[PDB]
């Protein structure tokens with residue numbers, strides 16, 4: 001049953017053909033349960049760390065390194081015999097690494113709880129129904145409740161499904177819809193039909209939402225809807241249908257994988273296009289099976305040479321070192337990768353209260369009527385001092401303390417403020433400061449009537465706790481509060497019925513004390529109180545009163561105002577239908593305006609500047625809020641969302657305004673919009689959506705399951721420390737302190753973490769372009785492979801591994817925040833940056849081939865046969881060009897391999913320095929700025945040395961320590977790269993700029 005709130009109580013029974021007294025027949029419970037299904041949310045879709053690992057191996061590159069592991073096996077030999085112990089490492093090291101890389105994409109790549117799974121913690125187990133096949137209140141599994149059947153809720157219950165209230169058995173009924181909203185204060189319910197078919201949840205005051213708690217009272221009602229069809233069930237369903245996109249990194253990293261997988265099997269057919277000459281060899285001679293086996297050593301070599309295998313380990317380290325770093329600045333980031341996407345944040349929508357402002361509301365201007373004669377309408381207006389809830393501060397007229405109670409009207413102003421108030425102060429003994437109890441707005445009122453002190457109650461001889469609510473009390477002695485008519489968005493006010501108590505003066509009857517939004521309250525006064533007299537409300541009087549409320553609210557004070565009026569002669573106690581919330585506004589009529597108080601909710605000292613920081617960072621801030629559009633805008637100026645004078649006509653919208661536009665101009669309104677006043681949570685989704693239709697990366701605050709759907713949709717959902725459970729689960733980032741500037745900080749950190757990533761990502765790659773171009777020479781010119789698998793793995797995992805990581809501690813630009821947000825269409829390698837890493841890659845693919853074969857050519861202690869056609873023969877089936885002598889097998893010597901390896905490692909340690917900045921010379925950007933890059937190189941070399949003289953290692957790497965003459969040739973052929981680099985830096989600096 002869909003629009004239940006809008007049907008009469010009988011209409012709802014007539015709809016399910018059920019008797020409020022008896023309940024659902026055990027037949028109906030059958031047919032129904034068939035029509036509607038069970039009162040549960042669909043079961044989890046499932047996961048598992050075994051199919052999670054299997055999912056990682058389906059990737060293209062991890063398909064290749066696993067193919068190279070297959071070939072690494074079909075290269076050696078068959079099944080068991082005896083021992084040449086040393087051998088099978090090359091296929092076992094990769095298979096080790098892959099498992100230790102799949103694993104790293106999981107148990108520190110958190111992929112676990114979702115805000116959708118959280119929504120199975122506010123669906124209850126047990127509910128209480130009245131079916132026909134008993135007579136007592138049979139408690140059943142919530143899961144088995146179903147539309148139509150009668151239900152019983154009492155204080156402390158979790159509401160089991162969405163329920164149209166039938167009758168309230170207790171005095172009143174108070175529900176706690178925190179989960180949806182977040183606003184501790186419970187709400188009153190009634191049974192009248194809310195007759196508008198499309199009423200928001202805030203206004204469905206005869207309904208209980210599944211997941212809510214009864215906070216007082218006890219009622220019986222009929223289930224309107226269950227399962228996915230309840231209000232919380234529908235929020236579940238929106239988050240279900242959300243397509244969750246990958247980050248701008250994992251997206252362009254994935255098309256790097258595809259580009260790398262395409263290049264490998266393009267070189268593995270390009271090497272073939274150069275060995276096509278083998279078709280001209282004799283049918284007899286050389287090794288058939290052997291022919292096949294060769295091409296498979298270079299394939300495997302080409303596999304490992306273009307990977308960068310460390311990458312994963314490095315990234316993960318870098319991100320996990322970012323999380324710990326943002327947590328210090330109060331940003332809890334939950335999703336790992338979120339830290340990179342945090343860096344392209346284009347737009348930030350923040351809630352006002354609590355994030356932009358401190359929710360420390362206090363009154364600080366107020367006025368009453370002074371005198372009224374024809375047109376002259378003079379006001380009598382004061383100011384209050386004190387930002388806190390503490391009863392410390394003073395009232396001043398004409399900028400100078402006055403004793404509040406000498407003004408008759410100020411008495412009334414305080415009387416209403418105290419009696420028409422549902423909140424209160426408390427002194428906290430621990431912190432040593434006052435506490436609000438209830439609404440912030442109301443508690444501010446309670447603090448006022450304290451500062452005011454209209455009766456001159458002795459207050460300085462009281463104690464911190466006793467005095468908090470002192471004068472309020474005195475006033476609660478004066479009038480007795482019978483009943484009270486709660487607030488409703490609908491009439492925008494609230495009022496309490498009061499009768500006098502002891503030997504007072506009031507008499508002849510009692511009064512209603514109304515307190516609500518202006519116009520609302522003012523449009524309902526026929527009389528104005530001037531002093532203790534009263535006179536009829538006139539145009540000129542009204543126009544004053546409004547002119548000032550407008551000035552205060554829309555001024556540079558940005559005050560929120562309340563009108564305070566009284567019904568001097570109220571309806572008879574037995575004339576008002578107190579269950580009929582719809583009729584509350586008529587009882588609040590024919591009021592007498594008493595006066596207006598205006599309060600403030602100060603913007604965080606921090607935010608002002610933070611906002612500016614985003615201006616310069618090129619990122620847009622949108623402030624969502626609940627103030628009226630006028631004051632909404634005025635707060636925007638004050639925090640500098642807008643300039644103090646500038647146009648804003650089509651830049652701020654309200655809830656209703658925004659709804660009145662057809663989609664095209666809603667979509668439009670979103671790229672220029674900065675401020676939304678009085679919005680539905682419904683809109684937060686629509687706004688995120690629209691912002692994305694503009695490829696904006698959107699940070700979005702919100703709390704309560706109401707805002708869960710948009711914290712999901714937003715690239716960066718942001719919950720609050722103080723927030724609800726579910727909201728947090730829906731976000732990717734949580735402000736431990738709720739501060740808006742905590743967002744801004746985190747976006748800058750994320751800006752820096754991505755910048756440093758762009759670096760070491762290109763560094764680790766820079767090697768792989770070299771390592772290949774090396775093995776392309778050692779194959780294209782037919783020498784002996786200067787580098788093999790088990791060497792390269794060490795370089796990519798460990799040799800470059802420590803320096804790449806240490807490049808994640810680089811000192812961030814001093815204009816890191818003074819440049820526009822980086823696009824999500826930026827490629828990590830492009831323009832002059834491609835030809836700079838095809839040079840450095842084309843230089844390493846030469847220097848590792850030069851100095852190694854140089855041991856086969858120009859060496860002293862090595863067989864130095866210059867131009868000995870190493871290209872012609874590595875078969876030695878002939879042994880004709882080498883007449884006398886008996887030794888071929890020196891082509892598998894450890895020393896030449898050790899020449900290439902020492903060239904690489906050292907160039908890498910050079911190129912690591914070349915990364916510390918993109919276009920600053922090592923002259924301008926000193927190598928000793930990153931103390932952790934120097935520290936890493938240090939540890940990198942002392943590993944190149946370790947694997948050379950601790951004998952097990954150099955035997956396994958197939959190496960042997962080079963002589964001191966074989967150490968200088970390295971530095972002769974290695975260092976020159978820092979020189980090729982600098983030339984490129986000062987060029988892109990000085991002829992590729994403009």
Ligand SMILES: Nc1ncnc2c1ncn2[C@@H]1O[C@H](COP(=O)(O)OP(=O)(O)O)[C@@H](O)[C@H]1O
Pocket residue numbers: 351352353489624625626627655678679680
């Ligand atoms: N859509 C609306 N229509 C009318 N008034 C509203 C609406 N949204 C909120 N308000 C009022 O605005 C007041 C201030 O909202 P605010 O403190 O911004 O809310 P929030 O917790 O969303 O920040 C709320 O107390 C509520 O009384």
Ligand SMILES: CC(=O)C1=C(O)N2[C@H](C1=O)[C@H]1c3c[nH]c4cccc(c34)C[C@H]1C2(C)C
Pocket residue numbers: 056057059060061062065097098099100101102103105253254256257307308309310311312
């Ligand atoms: C077993 C496992 O899950 C993984 C891995 O073990 N790896 C990565 C990978 O995801 C591989 C990969 C996929 N896409 C890219 C882009 C850039 C770099 C890499 C990759 C490294 C790859 C490898 C094999 C190290």
Ligand SMILES: [Mg+2]
Pocket residue numbers: 351353354
């Ligand atoms: Mg809020």
